[PDB]
Design a protein around this ligand. Structure first.
Ligand code: DUD
Ligand code: DUD
Ligand code: DUD
Ligand code: MG
Lengths: 125, 125, 125
């Protein structure tokens, strides 16, 4: 069906899941203990691969929590409906102090955003 | 109805409003005079609480103006349809020079983005 | 029709185009050789002007490539359906080392994201 098809590639991996009735995203957790460097970025591995529903891509959005408290932001984050590989979550540390991530930690959130994918019309001949 | 239900929690607060026919967002103003630190972040208070329409969350997006001119970016920014609290706008100063915000200043913009919230289908048994 | 109407304003300009069947965005290329400064931002010119389809705005999203490899992020990025001017792509260099951009380089990607633009309902009288 056209829901969020998820495929774990490591048992450690968690199934994305929304935290509330009105929640906009499905939590995305870390599958490795990593350190996102001060003023630096890192590529955390989710351990899963997903197929967003049709006519809608998946945007890795930042979590209110880590943003406010640790100045953690999310770089890139555009997952195409044709992406068969593993979801990588690229975080950027806005702080002068390192951030610690442990297997299991919800490090971001997926949001199936509806988009229109029409053809291009070039004007000016 | 399913429009943008807004609830001011301080008279100082401004009603979000789109700046043009084709505008994608409703302006979100500051309700306090604050300073967003160089290479730092701050949590500006909007003074309002909103309920995005159904099947669509609210994304606090950055303003072309402040982005270009002061290197002001917007962290976090995901407001769930079930959020009953006050909207906080988390800004991050990309500059080596402080930025000044005064009650009333449009500091960001809300965008009711349509999303699909289906269930999760786990493959691999 | 309601597709992506594109208008080149310099022959150098490239027509936005999706890189795959499931791709979520249309590549947006640079039309000038520019340098986005370490820990700095710049406004790259696309040389084109577009009209996103109706009931959907255009979001300049970052490319997985440049994000991971050079720590390149995209500031602002909200293009309203009523924008008649030229698309400017504002990039922010997260790195301590400069980044080089050359006419033609795909520097970002446009994503026609569906949004709802209803009226505002103010509660509390
Ligand atoms: O934060 C991100 C952003 C993207 N992707 C995946 C989803 C998408 O399907 C693929 C895109 O890589 P690319 O588009 O082929 O390279 P580029 O963006 O330079 O065109 O990378 C991630 O795993 N994490
Ligand atoms: O910039 C933001 C981002 C989110 N929120 C609100 C909207 C949402 O309903 C709530 C989410 O907090 P949380 O999701 O419960 O904490 P976490 O993101 O770590 O799960 O915070 C804001 O006010 N400002
Ligand atoms: O990265 C961006 C972001 C926006 N715009 C364009 C699209 C939009 O139509 C216009 C908006 O400028 P503005 O909204 O009138 O100034 P402000 O955001 O302070 O209201 O700028 C760009 O070209 N590049
Ligand atoms: Mg940033």
């Amino acid at each position: 069906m056209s829901s969020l098809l998820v495929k774990k590639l490591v048992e450690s991996a968690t199934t994305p899941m929304r935290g509330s009735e009105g929640a906009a995203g499905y939590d995305i957790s870390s599958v490795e203990d990593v350190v996102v460097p001060a003023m630096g970025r890192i590529a955390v591995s989710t351990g899963i691969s997903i197929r967003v529903p049709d006519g809608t891509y998946g945007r890795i959005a930042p979590r209110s929590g880590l943003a406010y408290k640790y100045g953690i932001d999310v770089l890139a984050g555009v997952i195409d409906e044709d992406y068969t590989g593993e979801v990588k979550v690229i975080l950027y540390n806005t702080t002068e102090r390192d951030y610690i991530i442990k297997k299991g930690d919800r490090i971001a959130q997926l949001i199936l955003e509806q988009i229109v994918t029409p053809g291009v019309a070039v004007v000016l001949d």
